[PDB]
């Protein structure tokens, strides 16, 4: 569950979570231990970068099916 | 029969289960990147 | 989670469904999280 992303989303991602897609694509067995290693990269993955768009039961396309950063 | 597709939109725009058989092997995907949506293989 | 069961069995009547009995053991129960309302079989061509 590793990426380049907002320093806010670092504080979030786990299975069975609030809303549509964070339950549906992440409908995993109960047990978890949500922890994270991260560091800032605005000098490495930015100068200048906007490639941070990401995507009834289980109707996932391509919480929500569309959100973006940059 | 190369295999099957199952889902709601059946076109990878929504999540779309693809199943394929090659020899005795079976290969399965659910993805949104477009498949061989044209099924063709030359017999 | 998508569940599949199957058989391979000798039917001489290649046209049509047989009389008599067949029970299918499972292959897989894939943990995928999908919903289904349609399906299509994919075929090769001459």
From Swiss-Prot, chain A:
Changing residue 47 to T: In strain: Omicron/BQ.1.1. Residues 49-55 are annotated as: Immunodominant HLA epitope recognized by the CD8+. Changing residue 54 to F: Decreased HLA binding to NF9 epitope. Increased binding affinity to human ACE2. Residues 6-8 are annotated as: Integrin-binding motif. It comes from the Viruses. Changing residue 67 to N: Reduced host ACE2-binding affinity in vitro. Attaches the virion to the cell membrane by interacting with host receptor, initiating the infection. The major receptor is host ACE2. When S2/S2' has been cleaved, binding to the receptor triggers direct fusion at the cell membrane. When S2/S2' has not been cleaved, binding to the receptor results in internalization of the virus by endocytosis using host TFRC and GRM2 and leading to fusion of the virion membrane with the host endosomal membrane. Alternatively, may use NRP1/NRP2 and integrin as entry receptors. Binds to host ACE2. RBD also interacts with the N-linked glycan on 'Asn-90' of ACE2. Cleavage of S generates a polybasic C-terminal sequence on S1 that binds to host Neuropilin-1 (NRP1) and Neuropilin-2 (NRP2) receptors. Interacts with host integrin alpha-5/beta-1 (ITGA5:ITGB1) and with ACE2 in complex with integrin alpha-5/beta-1 (ITGA5:ITGB1). May interact via cytoplasmic c-terminus with M protein. May interact (via N-terminus) with host bilirubin and biliverdin, thereby preventing antibody binding to the SARS-CoV-2 spike NTD via an allosteric mechanism. This is Spike protein S1. It comes from Severe acute respiratory syndrome coronavirus 2 (2019-nCoV). The gene is S.
């Amino acid at each position: 569950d590793s990426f380049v992303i907002r320093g806010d989303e670092v504080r979030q991602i786990a299975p069975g979570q609030t809303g549509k897609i964070a339950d549906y694509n992440y409908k995993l067995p109960d047990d978890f231990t949500g922890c994270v290693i991260a560091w800032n990269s605005n000098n490495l993955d930015s100068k200048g970068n906007y490639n941070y768009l990401y995507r009834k039961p289980f109707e996932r396309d391509i919480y929500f099916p569309l959100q973006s950063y940059g | 029969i190369r295999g099957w597709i199952f889902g709601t939109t059946l076109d990878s725009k929504t999540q779309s289960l693809l199943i394929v058989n090659n020899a005795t092997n079976v290969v399965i995907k659910v993805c949104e990147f477009q498949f061989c949506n044209d099924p063709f293989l030359g017999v | 989670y998508f569940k599949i069961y199957s058989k391979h069995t000798p039917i001489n009547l290649v046209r049509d469904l047989p009389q008599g009995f067949s029970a299918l053991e499972p292959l897989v129960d894939l943990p995928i999280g999908i919903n289904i309302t349609r399906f299509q079989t994919l075929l090769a061509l001459h």
